Symmetry: D2
Subunit: 499 residues, 4 copies
């Protein structure tokens, strides 16, 4: 009796008992006598502007679509909650970490990157794992990928990068030259490239993948002590990837594979879950790290900085209306309540700006006012007013300037940001040469096995092959620098593909 | 102390009581630690991207403004109720007239016409009197002026009319050449131009003027019998207008005179009111009527068509937040509940398209979702989805197609349009010379008395005198047609004015 | 060496040689010193708002996306010209057909339907074939499809139809319950559904494939005599379709298959072309003719109304910048120069509003000001002003109200529309029953050969086999209502799929 | 014959002697038959959607309005040129100062601050004076006011400030409590408040007022040597302001007095001009300066930092279409070319963000492409693409990723920002007490004479008298802090006013 998903309407008509259906109305609420036959003059005459029943619906029709996400356009979402299982208060005075058994409702949206709205899940691309913590101190957004690292470490190259992985400005077709001309000129991607073309390249569904905040963040206890951290939410359904083969099969067989896997899962009562951990680094150690603790192209070896469990990320309800609750979702890295703060991680810094920016454009100035985005477990009160599509009462007739002598909202000094010290010139400091191989080399011949080491080298060559020859070399060169073998294997492969 | 309007905050803080100032949060609901000083590297250093309290706030301010209404930009609003005092049901079956005593929540917006957001209330100009009935059959928006007639009878000339009435495309100044060159070329305006330059051209506040639906409408009863009608809502505060010197004074002394007079009255249990009447006419009568019964430049003489009392219009509530409840208010003449239907009035016909059309651009595709515009009395159920800034549930997961087989919203034969028959060549009929003198002639001699006729001519001459001689000629000519004396009197003044 | 599309950048550079690369600047033209390293205080310090180079690029990137077309998102486009080869002057006075040899620049975008921007080119779904003629009497948009009929005959059914073919409101996946449920309760779709599931369902590229004006139109000659007609532009590369499996693999092998094909063809000098034909029907015949001549689910048979030759459609130019020239492309069926006029088609009429309406939403109010949409081979002069993103000079200091005595644009009586007579009550006429089978049966037998007839039934069952039985019944019922074996054959197929 | 502005259309008609009126067309370029009569039913029948000429025009009319500037909405603009007259090449290497005689086009917009578009010109209020220099190195926007200081010093107070300066959230009226409750609590304003209420508060048009950069900026020469500065461009027409008397008369007799004046002056060859001087403070002196050198509520005494002639700002060309060339006009302080950078001024810092941020909303993502805003004197080349209302060729088929090996634009190292060192903890430093009286006292006692102090206190007390008693206390208290005599005089006046 198909799957829970396919029976979407099925279950709807049922649960809708036997009570009559609501009356079809116009946006205004005026009942429609007949919305199947246009208002015409004669059985074969023209249409009347007077058929506002028509205009009303058609009008709305022509405006349903809104701009898709610049990146991560294709994804799925579900709601659930978080719960504490450990006490890290000695680490961060965040309200969500209150005490054990302390729950918080969440929202999540998995997704790919380069692919548009029509794209299919089952394909090589990093994955999006975003969590919205509707806390008491406002919503907390831990926007993270399925990997602890990224290709670039300076926000200034992301626009270019994304462009590189997307379409040709002219042909509107994917383009290897673009893809690899960028990667080749910027070896800093070496680390993440290797992760993309590794088995992890294509997770089997969203449920069998690990979550990562990626960036280095900052924790601060109710005592004013701050320490750098890294979030890790590992899957409790075990890691499971998809063969280049299956992936491509599913790709066209069920483009929305990863999509319904999630739905049915939650429907068949088999709710997904991830275990939230966090690494820790004192400012002392941070000054010692063999690298930049804020370099997005690096990791904190688990041996030197072990994961501390903190909580359970459980999803148990699926969106009722996809658009409203998922397509419309807004995740802002800048959304961090008292206890959690960003690090000087140049990429994070940029994200502090881009997300709310794009949201205002994709969704609208008052998008945080959208049900799904509104921090309902907090009391939003301030001196911001109006704006297009202003919902709510817009804070009634309350004094709209600060300061004021009329009892309008005051600032809670107990939430002040954490004071740090920086000494140096304001300049554009070149981070293009901050070691792009070390951690990579120990990933090729260390994290991976000879078995999957060959699968990786294959996956890569199967794409790099399509790039101009002048591109192919410069590329191998990099892989070469990570390890002559990790570069020779790939090359060999190319020579064969290359005929 | 001072007036209620001026005591806005005072009263707010008192009612607020001894409570504690809500915690000042970002749009995201995060507490602010100090919204008075920016995050900088040093006491005299750069501003950091890291300051999201600033940007969260700043970015909203930058997006505070929405386009003002292209016309009737300046205005004041108030909510109240509509009470049925009679049984008119013998004509219209709208559930808004159902049973005597039946109260229907209403919203009202008064306004001028030409002036933009910052203009003054005390200037000569028609006046807007929009009434929104939140009925159980959706919303009823009766968008009427304080005059029963208008300057033109074909929408095709409205865009141009409003242009001539506003600013010159290059100097951005008021243009008497645009104003009069247009009016002169369209004598059909003579009627309303008369009513305009008369003592009624500037009413003393909104509480002292009448409200007219202007257009001819339609009423369909339970049996399905229809009738043409006109709406009339006379003022219970009595017709009181302002003099050129006093209106001209208040222009600078208090540009928001109307907005204030209205706030204060209501704030002191001094609720304004209007009795609602209607002129009922038969298709057979509309057949006999000597003039085009749908021509916007004509009136239905009280004599032959006496007014029938319907109910009362009380405004007993003031807007809490002006932007959210007034600025965003949107009345669409097409929102007529079952029982009320439009008429062939060319003018009205065009308005059926414009209001929601422009509302989509001024407010947004989902404007009908704004609390003030939402038909909170009736239940909105249909097959329209998505659209930017989608509030509520987007009808959750109910079927989006129609018809369907899963118990989704159904038709309503009862609420069907009343069918009328028309015959003729579908073409653009020149309605330019449908007599633009007869009714003005009566207004000039029978409606006005000598002292009023005196003013009407000085008021005209005082503004017309700035247009070029040739326009003045053409202009006067049209006046003599209504009446020899009308022309000569104005002409007389012009020669004087032309020193 | 590789295909022309792949070598896009390669050539762009090659030809750009002998030239120094332009200086990288900001949106404002200020040269940037370094666009790879953000501005921070100290090498490991926070990002400074100061870095305006950053915000400029990021803010713009954060807004690259505009809403995709509500339908026909996945498409491709090219440019060419139209050449008059034959004289149909006695039918249309339209300057486009003026003389033999008359060249008129054109632009075209082909597309699929339901699938979103990321979808693949080769799938069962009709194909949009819109043609924009930049004529001296303004642009003429012939928004056609690769089929001469459509699933429905009343605009009111469209928003609902489209929803069925799209995603589920809650599970966001494609849904056969909606697809069929709709098609079941709506049999008039039979004609098109058959054609669709036919071999033509997956044309090769956008070349080989035919284009049809689809709707019935009206032609007017220099003597006011009007006649009805159907537009036809047959491929010069002969109808060639894709196999189910073939197209099924290309689906993931190369989703942009069309894009590639069309680009490379043109790029290599292999410019495709089409021959335009017209079927003419006189008002007399339109009267006698034996189902509604304006029904969109019906077709005129070359039998009685033989195809007449008019001219050639040649595409010899590729888009330089895709987004700018194809994505932003807007076609309005309502754009018809003198000689061409709408027809009572309930379906058409509706299109007369949706298109510009949605364009103002998706592209913006001044969309006709975007280069490729501008009627550049004409002289747009009128009384329209302002609007957002207003380009040009807003028509400069020209008078902006009509009429006027200042030499502003005067209208042309010549361009007056042809008048027709339409008698009959103005109401909602039921058309759900206008024969949704006759012609359909003639396709299954006469047109379709035992060969295609086999794959048609097979293709239908292959899809329909996923919907509840109660639907399958209704679906087979209508088919057998066309011809016993039609559904009979389907039914057999259906039962095997249901294990 | 009237003022040159009155005859706008006259000279336009005259302008095209001869020349025949262009043909009235739709937005698509289709010629119009009858633009005065809609297409109806019969002479008294309904309207047909089939009428596109109407809908084309109406839909546009319905979207003419865009959000008015959040502040400084009511203004006037003009174009002219900038001419170098002194070699200041030892301080700035900017090309706009490249060499004596060199002329650069400029665009200027004058403005009030609080009133919306309908507001009156002649009212006490600072005055906006923005200059746009279309320099070879991109556009340089010097966004100055008519005062060298400002009320607040930290951007976070700005939204608040402006709010208190506008209408009441509930009553929508100007709130004296709002105005003085805010000023009373933030004494840093005293300086501006005093300047504001002096004879300089209501200038006589835009031609008789000085223009000031206000903020301190950083000039950078060819040797990479930096220096701080302040821009001053004094009227050549002489500082002339209006009296509280005439100003109130003009407020109703001519709400557009400034608009009209500027136009006419230019129209009659009487071009206004301004001599541009600059002040120079070396990094050393900025160290021992008695006040914070980047504090907006302070000035650099001519005595120690003498003005230096640079060149002349001349305006000799009126806008042809106010909207297209003035209303749409946009200035960004961020637009600074090589040799002209920002200071750490907390206020200037927040501005680098807000202008482009707001322009992207008021005008749209691609507002830099609007003619008036485009840097048409430089070659904009970069890796930015798409966005709505994308004009030009969107950089065509150029490589869209940086870096790339395909000859796309490259960064110019000689346009890098001058590196400055800053050291301190990153925190929210409190500048609320950075001396808010010294300079004020000098203005009161030295800059003004008795006659003046008298008018000032009268002007201050005039408004203040309306605020609640407790607010008057606080305010007078602050004035006494500047000078015992200062507060007393105001207090005496208050004592009076209050009966
Ligand atoms: C009466 C039902 C129809 C309505 C209301 C309708 C509505 C729409 C809308 C709103 C768009 C998006 C336009 C844009 O954003 O540029 C569109 C696009 C399109 N439709 Fe129609 N459509 C209808 C029927 C069809 C049929 C019947 C055809 C086949 C001749 C067709 C061919 C197209 C094409 C080719 C496009 C994309 C044009 C392009 O930009 O390349 N549609 N339709
Ligand atoms: C519009 N009145």
């Amino acid at each position: 009796n198909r799957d829970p998903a396919s029976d979407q309407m099925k279950h709807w008509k049922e649960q809708r008992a036997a009570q009559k259906p609501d009356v079809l109305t116009t946006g205004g609420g005026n009942p429609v006598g007949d919305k199947l036959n246009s208002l015409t003059v004669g059985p074969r005459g023209p249409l009347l502007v007077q058929d506002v029943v028509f205009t009303d619906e058609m009008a709305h029709f022509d405006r349903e679509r809104i701009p898709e996400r610049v990146v991560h356009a294709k994804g799925a979402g579900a709601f659930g909650y978080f719960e504490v299982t450990h006490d890290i208060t000695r680490y961060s005075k965040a309200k969500v970490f209150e005490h054990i058994g302390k729950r918080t409702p969440i929202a999540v949206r998995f997704s790919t990157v380069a692919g548009e709205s029509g794209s299919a899940d089952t394909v090589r691309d990093p994955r999006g794992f975003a969590v919205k913590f509707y806390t008491e101190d406002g919503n907390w957004d831990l926007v993270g990928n399925n990997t602890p690292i990224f290709f670039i470490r300076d926000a200034l190259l992301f626009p270019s990068f994304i462009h590189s992985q997307k379409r040709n400005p002219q042909t509107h077709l994917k383009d290897p030259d673009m893809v690899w001309d960028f990667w080749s000129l910027r070896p800093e991607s070496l680390h993440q490239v290797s992760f993309l073309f590794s088995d992890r390249g294509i997770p089997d569904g969203h449920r069998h993948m690990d979550g990562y905040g990626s960036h280095t963040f900052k924790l601060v206890n109710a005592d004013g002590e701050a320490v750098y951290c890294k979030f890790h939410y590992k899957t409790d359904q075990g890691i499971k990837n998809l063969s280049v083969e299956d992936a491509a099969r599913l790709a066209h067989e069920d483009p929305d594979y990863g999509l319904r896997d999630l739905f049915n899962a939650i429907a068949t009562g088999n709710y997904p879950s991830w275990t939230l951990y966090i690494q820790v680094m004192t400012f002392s150690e941070a000054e010692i790290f063999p690298f930049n603790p804020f370099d997005l192209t690096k990791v904190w070896p688990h041996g030197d900085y072990p994961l501390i469990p903190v909580g359970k990320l459980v999803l148990n309800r699926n969106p009722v209306n996809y658009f409203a609750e998922v397509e419309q979702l807004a995740f802002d890295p800048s959304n961090m309540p008292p206890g959690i703060e960003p690090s000087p991680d140049k990429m994070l810094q940029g994200r502090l700006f881009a997300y709310p920016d794009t949201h205002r454009h994709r969704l609208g100035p008052n998008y945080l006012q959208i049900p799904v985005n509104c921090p309902y477990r907090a009391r939003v009160a301030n001196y911001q007013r109006d704006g297009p599509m202003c919902m709510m009462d817009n804070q009634g007739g309350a004094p709209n300037y600060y300061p004021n002598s009329f009892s309008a909202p005051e600032h809670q000094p107990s939430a002040l940001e954490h004071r740090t010290h920086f000494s140096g010139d304001v300049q554009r400091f070149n981070s293009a040469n901050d070691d792009n191989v070390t951690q990579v080399r120990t990933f090729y011949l260390k994290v991976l096995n000879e078995e999957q080491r060959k699968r990786l080298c294959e996956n890569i060559a199967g794409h790099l092959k399509d790039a101009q020859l002048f591109i192919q070399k410069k590329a191998v060169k990099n892989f070469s620098d990570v390890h002559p073998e990790y570069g020779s294997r790939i090359q060999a492969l190319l020579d064969k593909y290359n005929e």
